[PDB]
Amino acid sequence: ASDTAVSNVVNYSTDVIYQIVTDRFVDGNTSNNPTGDLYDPTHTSLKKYFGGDWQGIINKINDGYLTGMGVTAIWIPQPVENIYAVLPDSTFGGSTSYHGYWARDFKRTNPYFGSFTDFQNLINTAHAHNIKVIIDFAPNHTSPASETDPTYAENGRLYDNGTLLGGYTNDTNGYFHHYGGTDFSSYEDGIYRNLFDLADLNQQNSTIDSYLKSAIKVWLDMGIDGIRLDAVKHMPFGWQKNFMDSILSYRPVFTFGEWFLGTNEIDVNNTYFANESGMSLLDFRFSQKVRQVFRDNTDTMYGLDSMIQSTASDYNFINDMVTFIDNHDMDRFYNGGSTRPVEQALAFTLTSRGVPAIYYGTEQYMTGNGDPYNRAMMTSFNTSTTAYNVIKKLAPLRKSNPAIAYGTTQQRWINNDVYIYERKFGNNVALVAINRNLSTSYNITGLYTALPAGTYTDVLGGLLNGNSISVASDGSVTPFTLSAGEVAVWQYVSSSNSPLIGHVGPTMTKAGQTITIDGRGFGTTSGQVLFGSTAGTIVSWDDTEVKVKVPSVTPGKYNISLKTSSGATSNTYNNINILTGNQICVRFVVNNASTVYGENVYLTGNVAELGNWDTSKAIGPMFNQVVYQYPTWYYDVSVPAGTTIQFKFIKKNGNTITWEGGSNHTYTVPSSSTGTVIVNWQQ
Ligand SMILES: OC[C@H]1O[C@H](O[C@H]2[C@H](O)[C@@H](O)[C@@H](O)O[C@@H]2CO)[C@H](O)[C@@H](O)[C@@H]1O
Numbered sequence: 001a002s003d004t005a006v007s008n009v010v011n012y013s014t015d016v017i018y019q020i021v022t023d024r025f026v027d028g029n030t031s032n033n034p035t036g037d038l039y040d041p042t043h044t045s046l047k048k049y050f051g052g053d054w055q056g057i058i059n060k061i062n063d064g065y066l067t068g069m070g071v072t073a074i075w076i077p078q079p080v081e082n083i084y085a086v087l088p089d090s091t092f093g094g095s096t097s098y099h100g101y102w103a104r105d106f107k108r109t110n111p112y113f114g115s116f117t118d119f120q121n122l123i124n125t126a127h128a129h130n131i132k133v134i135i136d137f138a139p140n141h142t143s144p145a146s147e148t149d150p151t152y153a154e155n156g157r158l159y160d161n162g163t164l165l166g167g168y169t170n171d172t173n174g175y176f177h178h179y180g181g182t183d184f185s186s187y188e189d190g191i192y193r194n195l196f197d198l199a200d201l202n203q204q205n206s207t208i209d210s211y212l213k214s215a216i217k218v219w220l221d222m223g224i225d226g227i228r229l230d231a232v233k234h235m236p237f238g239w240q241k242n243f244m245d246s247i248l249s250y251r252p253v254f255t256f257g258e259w260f261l262g263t264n265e266i267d268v269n270n271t272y273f274a275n276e277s278g279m280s281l282l283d284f285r286f287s288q289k290v291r292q293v294f295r296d297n298t299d300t301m302y303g304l305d306s307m308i309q310s311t312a313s314d315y316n317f318i319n320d321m322v323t324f325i326d327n328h329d330m331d332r333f334y335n336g337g338s339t340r341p342v343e344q345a346l347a348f349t350l351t352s353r354g355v356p357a358i359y360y361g362t363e364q365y366m367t368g369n370g371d372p373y374n375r376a377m378m379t380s381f382n383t384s385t386t387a388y389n390v391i392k393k394l395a396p397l398r399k400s401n402p403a404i405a406y407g408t409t410q411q412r413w414i415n416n417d418v419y420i421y422e423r424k425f426g427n428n429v430a431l432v433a434i435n436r437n438l439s440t441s442y443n444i445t446g447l448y449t450a451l452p453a454g455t456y457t458d459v460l461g462g463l464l465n466g467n468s469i470s471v472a473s474d475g476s477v478t479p480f481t482l483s484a485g486e487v488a489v490w491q492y493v494s495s496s497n498s499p500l501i502g503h504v505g506p507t508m509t510k511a512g513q514t515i516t517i518d519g520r521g522f523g524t525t526s527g528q529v530l531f532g533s534t535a536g537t538i539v540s541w542d543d544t545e546v547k548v549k550v551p552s553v554t555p556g557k558y559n560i561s562l563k564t565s566s567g568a569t570s571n572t573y574n575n576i577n578i579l580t581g582n583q584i585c586v587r588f589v590v591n592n593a594s595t596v597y598g599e600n601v602y603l604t605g606n607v608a609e610l611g612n613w614d615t616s617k618a619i620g621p622m623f624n625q626v627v628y629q630y631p632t633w634y635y636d637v638s639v640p641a642g643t644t645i646q647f648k649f650i651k652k653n654g655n656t657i658t659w660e661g662g663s664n665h666t667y668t669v670p671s672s673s674t675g676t677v678i679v680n681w682q683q
Pocket residue numbers: 411412413414415445446447448
C-alpha cells in the first residue's frame with residue numbers, strides 16, 4: 001500500500017477532512033429519533049436533536065456527494081452515549097446533548113446516532129469509498145452538573161457499560177474535581193477546575209485512568225482511523241501523554257487535540273503540547289489568521305506569511321497541523337456579501353501545509369454566527385456551487401502532488417493584498433497566487449519560481465479567475481495581471497524522485513513498535529532506515545512508504561533518515577521521540593519548597609521522560625494553587641511503568657538554578673495504575 005491509501009491511518013497530510021455535525025447532517029433513519037422534548041422534527045429549535053444520524057452519513061457516502069467533492073476523511077462528533085435530560089434554556093426553550101459532548105457512558109453508543117452495528121456500517125462504507133473516519137472523544141468531562149443541585153441535568157453521572165460509577169454529588173470515590181469552575185486565567189486553573197458547568201473528570205484517579213484507556217480501545221476495536229481529542233488545554237499534559245501512549249501501543253491512529261486559541265493569542269504551552277504529547281493539534285494560529293486576513297479585515301497578507309513562518313518555526317511536525325477556517329464553535333466563515341473570500345480561504349487551506357478540515361456546509365455558503373446558529377441543518381447538496389468545485393479541483397492534489405502534502409512553504413511575492421507562495425518537495429512544486437482585493441488588480445513583476453521552464457495552466461481552470469503563466473529557465477515568470485479576487489494554482493510533479501521523507505508517524509514510540517515513513521523515491525528494493533545512526537528492522541518497503549521496527553536505542557529524540565538499496569540518502573525527519581517503556585501518569589508532589597518572586601519549582605530526573613537531568617528541559621513550572629497550595633508544588637507526569645527513577649527538584653527564574661541538596665529521591669513507578677509520589681524539599 002502507498003502513502004495515500006485509506007489504510008494508512010497515521011498520516012493525514014494527503015487527505016482532506018470533512019467535519020460533520022451528525023445530528024445536523026442527514027436523518028437517515030427516523031425510527032432512531034428521540035421522542036418528546038428531546039426532538040424537533042421542524043429543525044428550527046437549535047439546541048434540540050434534529051435526528052441526523054450515522055445512516056444519513058452512509059447515504060451521502062454511497063450517493064457520491066462526499067466523494068464527488070474529493071473528501072477523503074470525515075470527522076464526526078463523539079459517538080458515545082450522551083445524557084437524555086433536556087436542560088432549561090431561556091433563549092431556545094430546552095438544551096440537549098445533540099452535539100455529543102455530554103457523555104454518560106464512553107463504552108456505549110449514542111442510540112440516536114445509531115447502534116454499534118450502525119457505527120460498523122459507517123466505518124465499512126467509508127473505507128469502501130477510501131474515506132477515513134475520525135471520532136471526537138472528550139475525556140475531560142461527562143456532562144453539566146451542579147453539586148448543590150443534584151436534580152440539574154443528570155448530575156454528571158458516569159456509567160461503565162451500563163454500570164453506574166458515580167455522579168458529581170456525593171462523589172465519595174473522587175472520580176471528579178470539586179474546585180469550582182475555570183476562568184481561563186492560568187494553565188493550572190483551566191485543568192483542575194470545571195470547564196463551564198461540565199463535571200470535570202479526575203484522570204489521576206486510577207479507576208478513571210483505566211476506564212478511559214479501556215473506553216478508547218472499544219472504539220479502536222470498532223476500526224476508527226483517527227481521534228480528535230476535545231479540550232486538551234483542560235487536562236494535564238502528563239496524563240494525556242500517558243493516554244496517547246496507551247492508544248499508540250494498542251493500535252496507532254492519527255490523533256489531534258483541540259487547544260483553543262483566540263486571535264493573536266500566544267501560548268507556549270500549546271507549542272510544547274504539539275511537540276511532546278504524542279498527538280497533533282488543530283491549528284488555531286492558522287485558522288484565526290486566515291479569518292483576520294480573508295474574513296474580518298484585521299491583518300494583511302504580510303500577517304498571513306508571518307503566521308506561516310512562525311508556525312513552521314515553532315511546531316516540530318508542521319505537516320500534522322490540522323487546519324480549518326471555521327468550526328462548530330466559531331462564526332460561520334461566510335457572513336454575507338461576496339462569496340469570493342470564503343472561496344479564497346478554502347483554496348488557501350487546501351493548498352497549504354498540514355491536514356485541511358472543512359466544516360459541513362461551507363461548500364453551500366451556510367451562515368450563522370455563534371453556537372448554535374452555526375449548527376443549522378445542512379441546507380443543500382447542490383454540487384454546482386463554486387465552493388464545492390474549488391474543493392473538488394484542489395482536494396485531490398494532496399494525493400497527486402507531494403509538494404502539497406509534504407512540501408516546504410516559501411513566499412514568492414507579497415503585498416497587503418497579494419500572497420504568492422510556493423510548496424516544494426524535491427522537484428515537485430506547486431505555486432499559488434491569491435489576490436484578496438475584490439476591486440483592485442496587481443501587476444506581478446519580479447516573480448521567481450522553482451517550476452521548470454514552460455507554460456502552466458491554472459489547475460482551477462479559471463474557476464476563481466485564474467490564468468496561465470510562462471516560466472523561463474532561470475525561474476523568472478513573465479509579467480502578468482493578478483485580477484481582483486483571483487486565485488490561480490500552477491504545478492509540476494516530477495517523473496522521478498531522489499529519496500525524500502515527507503512524514504513519519506507516530507512521532508512518539510518505543511523499541512519494537514512500528515513507525516510509518518512516507519514520501520517519494522525510496523525505490524522498490526529494501527534499503528535501510530536509520531534512527532540517528534542506528535538501523536531499524538524493515539517490516540515493509542515501497543517507493544512511497546516504508547514501515548520499520550524501532551531499534552533498542554537509548555530513549556530520547558531521534559532524527560530519521562532513509563537509504564535506498566543503491567545507497568542514496570534521504571533528508572532527515574527530526575524529533576521522533578523514543579520512550580523508555582509503556583507510560584504511567586504519576587503525580588509528583590514536593591513540600592516546603594519556598595521561592596522568591598518570579599522563581600518556580602521544576603522536576604528533573606534520570607530518565608528521558610524527566611529530561612535526563614537537563615535543567616533547560618526540566619518539567620514545569622510546577623503547579624501550586626488548586627490540588628495543593630504553595631509552598632507545596634505538584635505536577636502530573638508521564639513516566640515509564642515499573643521503572644525505578646531518581647529525581648530532584650530545582651528552582652529557577654531568569655538567572656540561576658538552585659538544586660535540592662542531599663541524595664536523589666527515588667521511586668518505582670507503578671506497573672499499570674496511576675501513582676502519587678510525595679517528598680520534602682531537601683536543602
Ligand atoms: O524579484 C525577487 C523578489 O520577488 C519578490 O518581491 C516582490 C515583492 O514581494 C512585491 O511586493 C513587489 O515589491 O515586487 C517584488 C518583485 O519585484 C519576493 O517577495 C522577494 O523575496 C524576492 O527577492
